[PDB]
Amino acid sequence: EKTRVLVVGGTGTMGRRIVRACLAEGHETYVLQQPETRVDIEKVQLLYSYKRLGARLIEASFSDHQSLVSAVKQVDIVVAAMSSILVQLKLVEAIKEAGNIKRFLPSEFGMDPSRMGRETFDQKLEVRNAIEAAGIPHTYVVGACFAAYFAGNLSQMGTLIPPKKKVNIYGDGNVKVVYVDEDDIAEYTAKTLDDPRTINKTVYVRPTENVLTQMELVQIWEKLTGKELEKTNISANDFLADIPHQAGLGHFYHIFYEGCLTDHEVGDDEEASKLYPDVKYTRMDEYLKIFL
Amino acid sequence: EKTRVLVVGGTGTMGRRIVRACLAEGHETYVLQQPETRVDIEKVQLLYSYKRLGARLIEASFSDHQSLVSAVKQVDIVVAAMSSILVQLKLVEAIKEAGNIKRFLPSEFGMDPSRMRETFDQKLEVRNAIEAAGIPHTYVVGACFAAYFAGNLSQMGTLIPPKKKVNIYGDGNVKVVYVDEDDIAEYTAKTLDDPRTINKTVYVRPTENVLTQMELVQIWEKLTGKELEKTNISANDFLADIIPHQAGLGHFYHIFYEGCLTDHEVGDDEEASKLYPDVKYTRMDEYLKIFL
Ligand SMILES: NC(=O)C1=CN([C@@H]2O[C@H](COP(=O)(O)OP(=O)(O)OC[C@H]3O[C@@H](n4cnc5c(N)ncnc54)[C@H](OP(=O)(O)O)[C@@H]3O)[C@@H](O)[C@H]2O)C=CC1
Ligand SMILES: NC(=O)C1=CN([C@@H]2O[C@H](COP(=O)(O)OP(=O)(O)OC[C@H]3O[C@@H](n4cnc5c(N)ncnc54)[C@H](OP(=O)(O)O)[C@@H]3O)[C@@H](O)[C@H]2O)C=CC1
Predict the structure, then answer these.
(1) What are the C-alpha distances in Å from B92 to residues A158, B5, B36, B72, B149?
(2) How many degrees, rounded to 5, is the angle at CA A43 between CA A38 and CA A48?
(3) Residue of A2, A102, A124, A165 marked catalytic
(4) CB of B36 within 8 Å of any CB in chain A?
(5) What are phi and psi of A216, to 5 degrees?
(6) Residue A124 catalytic?
(7) Contacting residues for A30 by C-beta, under 8 A, at least 6 apart
């Protein structure tokens, strides 16, 4: 009577946490094992370490439609976490022929691509159209900054840890951003995937106490270190000198200058911390303590 | 009272295991934090995960001689696990000026380079600098990492067992040493402050893991109950190293055709499993079970 979940992209940053959260949540957890992983000592040891935690491995290849069909027949629910976004179209074809899947959560976990208007959003929307054209019930998990990419570095670029003296502030740094521990995004995902309340819904991950401006985040760290940092404000115009990964920038712009993560309300029936209040999500003062 | 150990190369395949073995052995454990790691989400989270287990991080760079001196002045013992092998020469210079280091274990762990393409020259060149500087050492040698040679039944281009076919090298009756990387790490952690191994080579040659390739294959066949289709590759055929990545071959040749890991006996006073009989090392029938 356990839900059976196949995780596609199980050795990625988000993928490995979704695997563990599915196990932790009591699901019968299956991980897609792709042949290319056979030469990667990192991927191999991760996959087999899941086996010790009680997961099962299913060998399949995206270029072998029948192995995908055969993999998805063994489960009730499929989650993908890739970033190769469009390889999910082959997954949709498999799910459609198999016929037995109760829910597919595609590889979202970022800004809601339906709210933009770059090619990251196009490709997730292309995957969404196929999901819906095939009549596959779905849940889209959206709306958060990964703490590892945006909080641990106080939203500076080119680094993943907090800076020593100086920090760039974007605008007045008073634009609200949503900073979430990837583990919590994973736990929210593992709880939502068989929840009747969220079938065919978008679930917004917006834990209330993690709705913070860059300056509030910076001040969380100054309080932890006792040292104030040397701040340098950067304006929309100066920033938009992007003259490549010009696309990362400008995802950044939408988050930190336009407030795309917070410029719209979300109901309690569609917000993960309200849906799953027993998830004691990591506040950002806790998340940052590891760096002291 | 604890030995203070600095692990260099602490996010590597072997280095991460050594970090954990040192902590598990009760050593006050330090890990070098190189600046280049700052953009790699993988290395960063490994590094900081060690802090939760009680380890400390030391920031230093191989191009900053005085940062390396500041690092080693904080510990009693340095262990390196690198594979770039000649960056250890800068480490030797720093240790030499520091003056406080009681033992250095260089990045060895594989074939003994004192017998015996440039892998060996570089390791021998590191040993020479160590001994010239009069730095006390222990050289841990003599084993095949299971993940690279046992999990794949010693085939190439893959890290998991093959489904139907296997290449056998010669008759496959040359004795080889297959060792779980975790046991190499635990032996290293137990030996680095052992008075018995100061200025010695310690051979990691656990008695029951001295196996021919055919014996390794046969362990697998008894676990699966499937006989593999075997193809014998002769010593002369193999030396078609046509493809100048070819030193990886040839290393293989010395192990599997010439038996260089097992052709000289070793005394109990210099073999890891006799020096540390409380280490219940993983046998290959147990190691291979995870792949069933
Ligand atoms: N704060 C934010 O806004 C963040 C949001 N995200 C979102 O995370 C989601 C997942 O990304 P992430 O967690 O970072 O993980 P990764 O980018 O590290 O995903 C790695 C896994 O993706 C699989 N993969 C990638 N390309 C292919 C391909 N062509 N063919 C087959 N498999 C492939 C492989 O799975 P396998 O293990 O089976 O080999 C690989 O292990 C994305 O949707 C992204 O938008 C992530 C970045 C920041
Ligand atoms: N069965 C056998 O015979 C085998 C034996 N080995 C031996 O294992 C020992 C450890 O190697 P391995 O685990 O494979 O190493 P890895 O390639 O996994 O890397 C380990 C660390 O090396 C550091 N590193 C690599 N290059 C540089 C460089 N130019 N400058 C600074 N740092 C560098 C990095 O340190 P950091 O983590 O700090 O960022 C890296 O993480 C080797 O001596 C190898 O000969 C190798 C495979 C199997």
Answers:
(1) 31, 15, 21, 10, 31
(2) 85
(3) A124
(4) no
(5) -60, -40
(6) yes
(7) A4, A5, A6, A7, A55, A56, A57, A58, A71, A74, A75
